[PDB]
Design an enzyme around this catalytic site. Structure first.
Site, mmCIF file in Angstrom:
data_model
loop_
_atom_site.group_PDB
_atom_site.id
_atom_site.type_symbol
_atom_site.label_atom_id
_atom_site.label_comp_id
_atom_site.label_asym_id
_atom_site.label_seq_id
_atom_site.Cartn_x
_atom_site.Cartn_y
_atom_site.Cartn_z
ATOM 1 N N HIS A 32 42.613 44.616 44.966
ATOM 2 C CA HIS A 32 43.187 43.339 44.704
ATOM 3 C C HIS A 32 42.517 42.398 43.846
ATOM 4 C CE1 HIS A 32 45.049 39.408 45.622
ATOM 5 N NE2 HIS A 32 46.283 39.919 45.256
ATOM 6 N N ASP A 33 43.155 42.040 42.593
ATOM 7 C CA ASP A 33 42.452 41.146 41.658
ATOM 8 C C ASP A 33 41.216 41.299 41.582
ATOM 9 O OD1 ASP A 33 42.759 38.761 40.065
ATOM 10 O OD2 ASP A 33 43.451 37.488 41.628
ATOM 11 N N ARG A 69 44.655 41.559 35.984
ATOM 12 C CA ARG A 69 45.618 40.473 35.380
ATOM 13 C C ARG A 69 44.662 39.798 34.101
ATOM 14 N NH1 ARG A 69 48.123 38.904 40.350
ATOM 15 N NH2 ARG A 69 47.163 39.846 42.344
ATOM 16 N N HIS A 82 42.910 34.591 36.290
ATOM 17 C CA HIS A 82 43.293 34.360 37.586
ATOM 18 C C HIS A 82 44.127 32.943 37.674
ATOM 19 C CE1 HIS A 82 44.137 34.075 41.931
ATOM 20 N NE2 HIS A 82 43.545 32.906 41.757
ATOM 21 N N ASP A 274 41.321 43.660 49.799
ATOM 22 C CA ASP A 274 40.595 42.346 49.278
ATOM 23 C C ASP A 274 39.088 42.616 49.843
ATOM 24 O OD1 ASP A 274 42.748 41.120 48.155
ATOM 25 O OD2 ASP A 274 42.107 39.183 49.110
#
Length: 296
Positions: A32-33, A69, A82, A274
């Site tokens: 995630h991210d 992203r 972010h 994460d």
């Protein structure tokens, strides 16, 4: 590959799996991210950081799905972001990172999630989607076929999972609805369903409940190759005072990891986590991978 001992190999775990399984059916661990590993600012960390090791360590640990992203810049490029923060990582940097990993481990493939995190720069030239599809996607490593994306095809390249409208070129997973904060279910292509659990900004109690709940459904719906199951174990909040993505990962990963261990499931879906590392008791990513034994 006849053996089960192949799943234990994190850099080539997708080798023993038959070249006829839809990517959707495979229990693939994600991240995630992903592009937040470079965050060094203490105040920016307890809020932004959801990772601690670069894209190579990430996929060298079984991770085959990356939550990318980004934003459109003046220099007509796409850099990772972010919110309103530039993460000191770029989009080229990522694709270049996966190409190397894939040249080294041709058995693997990687699904690249992509969304417009921030608004295009006040001086850009083209649109967000156009810039990406004309300057990046137009690369060969980008699978251009769609439909029920089977493993036999994605082997060696990058499977793109769209999270942005305005797409004009074919390929990958067609961008769908995806409501803000919730467990939803919608249709993807003409032949598919998606059950995405993206309940960020919630209590630890509800969070772990919602994960297990979705993980229950998939675990039971372990034969419908026509159903994509996204499972975000990730949880965010007020950071600083032990509300950071780190505090939650330290419990949620080992906890949800155990849930998989005891259940001896066949299918656990795509589990986006994460802080993928090697310090949390059972390790989520290792458990997600192992649950593919039923496929070998």
């Amino acid at each position: 590959a006849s053996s089960v001992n192949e799943l234990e190999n994190w850099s080539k775990w997708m080798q023993p799996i038959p070249d006829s399984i839809p990517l959707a059916r495979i229990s693939i661990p994600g991240t995630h991210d992903s592009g937040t590993f470079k965050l060094q600012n203490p105040i920016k960390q307890v809020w932004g950081m959801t990772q601690e090791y670069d894209f190579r360590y990430q996929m060298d640990h079984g991770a085959r799905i990356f939550d990318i992203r980004g934003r459109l810049t003046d220099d007509n490029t796409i850099v990772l972001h972010h919110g309103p923060l530039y993460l000191y990582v770029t989009l080229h940097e990522f694709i270049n990172e996966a190409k190397q990993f894939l040249k080294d481990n041709p058995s693997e493939t990687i699904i690249m999630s992509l969304k417009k995190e921030y608004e295009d720069m006040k001086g850009a030239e083209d649109s967000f989607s156009s810039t990406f599809e004309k300057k990046y996607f137009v690369d060969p490593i980008f699978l251009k076929t769609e439909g029920n994306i089977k493993l036999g095809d994605a082997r060696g390249k990058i499977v793109l999972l769209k999270k942005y409208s305005g797409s004009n070129e074919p390929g990958g997973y067609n961008n769908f609805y995806w409501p803000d904060n919730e467990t939803f279910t919608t249709t993807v292509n003409q032949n598919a369903n998606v059950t995405v659990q993206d309940k960020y900004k919630v209590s630890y109690d509800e969070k772990v409940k919602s994960i297990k709940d979705t993980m229950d459904e998939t675990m039971n719906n372990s034969e419908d190759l026509n159903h994509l199951y996204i499972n975000f174990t990730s949880l965010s909040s007020g950071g600083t005072a032990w509300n950071s993505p780190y505090y939650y990962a330290s419990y949620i990963n080992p906890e949800i990891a155990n849930y998989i261990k005891q259940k001896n499931p066949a299918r656990v879906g795509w589990v986006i986590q994460d802080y993928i590392n090697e310090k949390w008791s059972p390790l989520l990513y290792q458990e997600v991978i192992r649950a593919n034994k039923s496929l070998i």
